[PDB]
Amino acid sequence: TKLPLIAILRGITPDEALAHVGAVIDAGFDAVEIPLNSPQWEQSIPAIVDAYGDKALIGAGTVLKPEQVDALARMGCQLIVTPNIHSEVIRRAVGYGMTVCPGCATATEAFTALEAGAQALKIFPSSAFGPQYIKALKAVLPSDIAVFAVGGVTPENLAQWIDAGCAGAGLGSDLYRAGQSVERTAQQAAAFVKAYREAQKQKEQRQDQKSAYALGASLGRYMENSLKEQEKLGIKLDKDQLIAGVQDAFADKSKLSDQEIEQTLQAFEA
Amino acid sequence: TKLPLIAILRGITPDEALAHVGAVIDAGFDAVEIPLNSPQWEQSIPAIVDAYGDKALIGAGTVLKPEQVDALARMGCQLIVTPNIHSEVIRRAVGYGMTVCPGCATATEAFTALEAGAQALKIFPSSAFGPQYIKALKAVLPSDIAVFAVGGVTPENLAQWIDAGCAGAGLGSDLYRAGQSVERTAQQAAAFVKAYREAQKQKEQRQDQKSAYALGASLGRYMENSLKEQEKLGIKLDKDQLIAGVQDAFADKSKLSDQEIEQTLQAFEA
Amino acid sequence: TKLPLIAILRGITPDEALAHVGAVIDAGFDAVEIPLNSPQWEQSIPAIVDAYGDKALIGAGTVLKPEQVDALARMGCQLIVTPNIHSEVIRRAVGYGMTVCPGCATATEAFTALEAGAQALKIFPSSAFGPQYIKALKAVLP
């Protein structure tokens, strides 16, 4: 899904479901789930599937029993989120072609979830463990498994989860608490989308910077090694001038013309 | 000849010729001439040809008449130096296979000397004109004509004549004045050889530095142009980091390992 | 010629000749010469004669041999500049009706150039001598 953020609306009621979901989707979310410990979820969920199922990944959270998966499939749920690893829940949801993001907290639990067919993992609650926990888990997890931080993720700290290796995050109480206004939902959802996109943008910029940055090193080493080659032929080049040439030319202020540079190098060959 | 300095011993007498010439040769000179306005030059010159003719380029200065060239040839003179351009003197000396370094002071006079077969030129007196005069003359003279500064050249200013484009210098009163001690001749000759070799060494170092120096520019431009290429693909590299890589690696302090550098560039390609 | 300045483009190549000459002419020059120690001058010169010969006094510098004058005449050179006084170069160039501005550095050399038919003189290199040198020469020159 386009943006890797899951809106988790725990305790939302059927009469408010459409408005709050419309808020989060309008702000940029394209995954939403309603926990099964929300009141009258079997009214809210099929309603949101029908209004928004073709606009966002719609599903359910706190899915604890195989028989709930069956009921949710019939309702048109596309997404199953859990707080725990329960192999048959995962296998059953996978069996319906639904997207499953089950919750684990340890290495052992993560590999159990993968063996049940999970293609993504929720680390829950992430807040107790921290970004470094995920970084540590990512050193043993298969490369293509998407990891989602859930639990105490804020628009302020989202950056650090993404930096640590999270593909995205599930946002609960910090996005929606039962009985808050639709306006508050639109505000928090805007904040998270901004934080992701701003944070994601920062990460991309950092990656670009890093990519630029080494280039220099490889050329610096190239030169260093060429000098050592020259030294063995009895040629010892002034090192500061060499760097000054690189800088000046790069800044469009070379004291030599392109023609000069070229005839000088030819003369140097000789 | 190995070192391009001519010892000019104006006013030397036959009884002192061998000692003073031995001094200059011992110090590193391999061209020596005795001006024909020196007393009893027809005694001194053949003596020095016989003692030193196989150790240095031996000859005569202030050669003004064709018939003097004839006499000097018979004496075993190998070198003819003049204060002026006189076409038949030059042609005659060339005709004996002698090395001629005739004296001119203007462009017109230099081209007359070349047309007479001169392979080298003496700018005399150089002191009135200065190093820049020679630099200006060298912009019109054939590339392979060796130009010698003569007149007010000192071990202190020799550098500036060589920088200006002189292949070497003829040294008169500043090296030998009639009636100075053999010890003074050895002292001044040592000073000039030192000044040439030190000065020549400095010039060579400067050339090496210049050769090193452009190299950078061409690489700096290379990078600048690669960046502009990247920019058109929507990639904007941090410029300070690029330079920092070049510097660090060159200094053997790259923050990336060679393996890292290589896998990063591969990733950048992607 | 309107403005008495000669553009001397030593070491210019054939591929850049037209642009650089067009620059100087556009700025106000109406005399231009390419020294014969420039690379492939026998390509650059006839090109500039053809593009600019009717817009500016076009010619050559560092002309040292009579036979070069012959070649330059055929190319449509209108102007001969030299670093030195060589009587037959001057006489030959004059003989083609070309404008000659030969280079001298002494009184004696200047009067030799006049006797060869020179109508103008180049003092070269002027920097060593200074403005006063010319002032002194002008007190004896026609």
Swiss-Prot record, chains A, B:
Q: Name one GO molecular function term.
A: 2-dehydro-3-deoxy-6-phosphogalactonate aldolase activity
What follows loss of this gene? Answer: Deletion mutant cannot grow on D-galactonate.
Enzyme Commission code:
4.1.2.21
Q: Which reaction does this enzyme catalyse, per its entry?
A: 2-dehydro-3-deoxy-6-phospho-D-galactonate = D-glyceraldehyde 3-phosphate + pyruvate
Looking up CDD domains in the UniProt record yields: KDPG_aldolase (cd00452)
Q: Answer yes or no on keyword Translocase.
A: no
According to its UniProt entry, the protein's GO biological process terms are: D-galactonate catabolic process
Question: What top-level class of enzyme does the UniProt entry assign?
Answer: lyase
Q: Which residues form the active site?
A: E33, K122
Q: What induces it?
A: Part of the dgoRKADT operon, which encodes proteins for the metabolism of D-galactonate. Negatively regulated by DgoR. Expression is induced in the presence of D-galactonate and galactose.
Protein name, UniProt field: 2-dehydro-3-deoxy-6-phosphogalactonate aldolase
What species is given as this protein's source? Escherichia coli (strain K12)
Q: What taxonomic ancestry is recorded?
A: Bacteria, Pseudomonadati, Pseudomonadota, Gammaproteobacteria, Enterobacterales
